[PDB]
From Swiss-Prot, chains A, B, C:
ATP binds at D47, I48, S49, G50, F51, T52, D99, K137, V399, N405, L406, A407, A408, R409. The chain holds residues 1 to 468 of 1610 of the full protein. Catalyzes the formation of the signaling molecule cAMP. May function as sensor that mediates responses to changes in cellular bicarbonate and CO(2) levels. Has a critical role in mammalian spermatogenesis by producing the cAMP which regulates cAMP-responsive nuclear factors indispensable for sperm maturation in the epididymis. Induces capacitation, the maturational process that sperm undergo prior to fertilization. Involved in ciliary beat regulation. Cleavage may occur to generate the active 48 kDa form. It is found in: Cell membrane; Cytoplasm, Cytoskeleton; Cytoplasm, Perinuclear region; Nucleus. Mg(2+) 1 binds at D47, D99. The keyword Cell membrane applies. This is Adenylate cyclase type 10. Belongs to the adenylyl cyclase class-4/guanylyl cyclase family. One of its GO terms (biological process) is intracellular signal transduction. It comes from Homo sapiens (Human). GO terms for molecular function: adenylate cyclase activity; ATP binding; ATPase binding; bicarbonate binding; magnesium ion binding; manganese ion binding.
């Protein structure tokens, strides 16, 4: 009697799970919104802005109308290598953005010390991929972490929150290229016998100079011991897979839950109802970047309902014009929604006027939400790269480009108001007294932004 | 000198062969119609109505417009497991329907006894897949079997005919969930030392309680002996494949013959000229279910020409409105054609009026065909699931849904007339005196059908 | 720590490299046009006109509208087997046409003798594939070879030039089916102890009767020695691949260079922005076959600038009507451009008039190019097969059909003028005095061509 080799792991549920971390795939939590949970872990923030800054080169006519295709190819080649390292070291990739990937090792508190060593080693091997002009910067943090899941009956989003999340970003912003920077708490919790550090000026974070373990240390055996505490590390019959999630079987109630995190156009591709290459494009869009600041952004029990309330209103406003939420994340200050008008063939006429009117609606509503202290919205319009970025087994749809960066910086450097770039102002054709021409500010990563404006709105008020 | 590994087995001919049983793939018979052949074998009928009854759940708004995709996924997950069992036990899957899969072990007469044991074991292992609310019922039969191939210059269809075919359906209809029921002849021909049975009330068919072989029996060695009589069991270099048909090489005359069994839209997908997911859908259609009853439905030499003659007329009528024949099979009573109006983007306006006019044309013509004793036609209109169901290596396009079941039951419970449901009656807008409102009958598997009608037609007559 | 198996070799750059020989893939040469280089090698010309002559059979209604699909399938089945032989024997497939594939073993001069033995053996094993009514003819040549790369900023083409290139075609034209014919120089350079030949009447080329090596010869060990001189033979970790090019990694500057050789519609498929089967079709087109004859067609330093100058003008003329250059090659006499009007959904109205006007423009301009001695252009219109022909790892878009052959023969048998077939003449509706009805000539491979015409043009002149 024959025993043919198992073949099928390419079901829709598996394809959906590529777009999500294990935190959600295996999370099994209530469908109640907001949902909050609390745990401990180590975070790795990998700054990949050296890679994503290539968007402007691939906009050149030298690329003969295949810029987007060539960009996604080269970006995924490099980003895949990072993803593989993270996954083989037992991490969970939580999110990708144009500037960063964020990864988590969730563990019981007693094991943080040893897991930090694993994550340091992983970080050093990531840097080793790129020795020899593209490099990364790594921030590490550890401690208490909160998770928030928000959404409605058809859409779900998650965030991780708290001081360790704030810390990993602060650590990464301190790093130079090639550096691994530990948060103050990470340094407090780590195994100091493993590593040599130096101080970072005006900072309690430290830089890892060397991982130099004791004479009898064996990293492979140490790692094996550490896998005891990694719930989903592929093992046994499945030790050849990068993710347990590659083994997921059809389960309609699970797929119902998971698909709510994924854009409809991505699901269309997953269902083989759209060509696999259709979402890789350089296309004109309008970015609406919404930042919500809170009295204390580390307390999920306070900021969770506020985010949910804001999200309900944002989604209703975006619905009217097929705007989408591409990403949500915590910045140093606040919770940010990266909204896009124009992307998977969702491109309405008057995209500009509508974008500004939607921004103002969002600003007005969110300003009155309990516990939201300041709302700031940046609106920028131009060509951006759109595509699924990452590895075959772990990837996400992402938007990358100067105008994304510009809208992000506008909302931080012009807090408390709705701002727009020159493309948006000029194109709207709305009367000029609906705007105010703003002072020019020098902004991180932004080379001449052009004139910027406040959207003051219809009335003098 | 290198020896790279063979790679390509994904030719169009291979893809076509997935939709067909070995009976046809390796059949090499005349292109003359009708064609009849005669042999012996064991039949397995697996009632999968417990699975296909899920259509109505996947029509829920909870499935967010991916009902069809989720349905096909979960159905193929389970049906694939059944298919694998059948194929590894050396069976030939002949046909899939919404309610059933039918499999054949063709063997010389002397080997029926031992092959029945193999098929009993297979049946028990199928039941074992599902221990722990979805289960199957299995009927087995054995004896003489006739094959009929009918069609024209561009399309071919086949059927298996005779008392063993009638028997496997009767056996399956007796079964409860989890049962394996043997036809009277199957029980007469089997190895009684292998099994313990019990009587089925008011029946000469039996239920298998246990397969309990003699103390020195070894099933793997027994099975190996039995493979001597299985012409196409994958073996040798190909013992890792589920089907020999996976090794078919390009052969234009063979492909010409095989493609005649497959719908044009399926061939479009096979030729990579249509997206692989385009045929999975919940779509409104009109089902026209035609039943032809004969004096003796076991005599292929009589019923074959009659079916051919009916088919020629059916196909001409369906052509005018892009109706398709989705399936043909033998019921307990008669030969049934499952016709569909609306499916692979074949969706004409006035689908209802035309469906009724086509049904009446078919009824009138077939009623005058020699040897056709009674014609009955059921017409029902609504949302049905359409998709390729089965395993990667053996699958068929199938239509599943309440309205398919309803049209099937109408043609059996209202014999000798053309009947239609309320959707069809109301929608046609044809004058009401073209119909007769019928008495309500309680029908198998049908919960309130709504008012039913006879299509009396244009004249009082 | 797990070590999952490398997976991804299916990047766009890899897919692009399938359409190109190693001569270009690993060529790294200047982007300056024309570019010429010089080397030595052995050439194999495999006449596959016995296969491509099947186009007319697959135009039959028996093929039910899947002629193109069935043709490409059967052609690629057989052509793949030839490709594999060539590649495992260490050859570089340079180009495919309807009539032939051309392969190269580039080696230092000292190794030509041993490489000829390898190529003879390869040729004999190719013939052995087909023992038992479809066969091939093989011509071999050896000696000095020149390469020319020409094009503009967006498109590149290459050719190999010189007496060995002229010779391999002459050798192939002498061969009967099943023959291996060596050029005079090939016979002069070969290891005569390995083979028995016979004279070819009225020719200094020879026919290989037998490869019969000395008693102690071992071909596998001989071949291993010969791989020392084969730069890109897959080896080591990659000895299971048919081409090193399967291992190419993303490299934007390399991909920029390579994509210039590939048609935009092919790149669309490569980028998963078009269905993989969309380019296999039987479609009406107009072939414009341009032949340029030179005083000496073996001197790249003379004919290179002339070809470049002609190409610049051809491309500008074709641009206006989305005509494409499908292939360029050296014939016995001259450099030929196979141009096509109508193919990857590039199908303009008045295709005929425009084709004739473009031909005349080309003729007039090229006639005045320095060093071009005679220009001849054949214009023929009808159904032709279009598709990607070859192996998964090495294939090219190709056009095949009677009208391609007819346009090719018209340009050779009616030199110095623009000629057209009856379809083109009749269809153009241009006044009849723009043409001259020509004498009928009996042409190779052409069975009744119908009336042929010269396009004299608008004025008596």
């Amino acid at each position: 009697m024959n025993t043919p080799k198992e073949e099928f792991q390419d079901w829709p549920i598996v394809r959906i799970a590529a777009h999500l971390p294990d935190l959600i795939v295996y999370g099994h939590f209530s469908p109640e919104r907001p949902f909050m949970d609390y745990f401990d872990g180590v975070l790795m923030f990998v700054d990949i802005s050296g890679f994503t800054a290539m968007t402007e080169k691939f906009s050149s006519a030298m690329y003969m109308d295949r810029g987007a295709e060539q960009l996604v190819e080269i970006l995924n080649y490099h980003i895949s290598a990072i993803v593989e390292k993270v996954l083989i070291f037992g991490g969970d990739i939580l999110k990708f953005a144009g500037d960063a990937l964020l990864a988590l090792w969730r563990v019981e508190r007693k094991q943080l010390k040893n897991i930090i060593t694993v994550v340091i080693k992983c970080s050093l091997e990531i840097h080793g991929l790129f020795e020899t002009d593209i490099r990364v910067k790594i921030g590490l943090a550890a401690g208490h972490i909160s998770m928030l899941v928000f959404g409605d009956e058809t859409h779900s989003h998650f965030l991780v929150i708290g001081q360790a999340v704030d810390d990993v970003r602060l650590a990464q912003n301190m790093a130079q290229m090639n550096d691994v920077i530990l948060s103050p708490n990470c340094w407090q919790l780590c195994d100091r016998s493993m590593i040599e550090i130096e101080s970072v000026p005006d900072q309690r974070a430290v830089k890892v100079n060397f991982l130099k373990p004791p004479p009898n240390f064996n990293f492979d055996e140490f790692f094996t011991k550490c896998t005891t505490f990694m719930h989903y590390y592929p093992s046994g019959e499945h030790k050849n897979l990068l993710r347990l999630a590659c083994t997921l079987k059809p389960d309609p109630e699970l797929e119902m839950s998971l698909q709510k995190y994924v854009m409809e156009s991505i699901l269309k591709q997953i269902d083989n109802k759209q060509l696999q290459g259709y979402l890789s494009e350089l296309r004109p869009v309008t970015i609406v970047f919404v930042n919500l600041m809170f009295e204390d952004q580390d307390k999920a029990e306070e900021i969770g309902p506020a985010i949910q309330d804001a999200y309900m209103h944002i989604t209703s406003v975006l619905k009217i014009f097929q705007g989408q939420i591409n990403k949500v994340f915590m910045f140093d200050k606040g919770c940010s929604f990266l909204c896009v008008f124009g992307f998977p063939g969702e491109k309405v006429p008057d995209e500009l006027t509508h974008a500004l009117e939607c921004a103002m609606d969002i600003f007005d509503f969110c300003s009155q939400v309990h516990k939201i202290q300041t709302v700031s919205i940046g609106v920028a319009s131009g060509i951006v790269f759109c595509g699924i970025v990452g590895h075959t087994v772990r990837h996400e749809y992402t938007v990358i480009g100067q105008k994304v960066n510009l809208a992000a910086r506008m909302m931080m450097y012009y807090p408390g108001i709705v701002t727009c770039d020159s493309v948006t102002y000029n194109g709207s054709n709305l009367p000029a007294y609906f705007f105010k021409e703003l002072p020019k500010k020098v902004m991180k990563g932004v080379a001449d932004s052009g004139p910027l404006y406040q959207y003051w709105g219809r009335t003098e008020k």
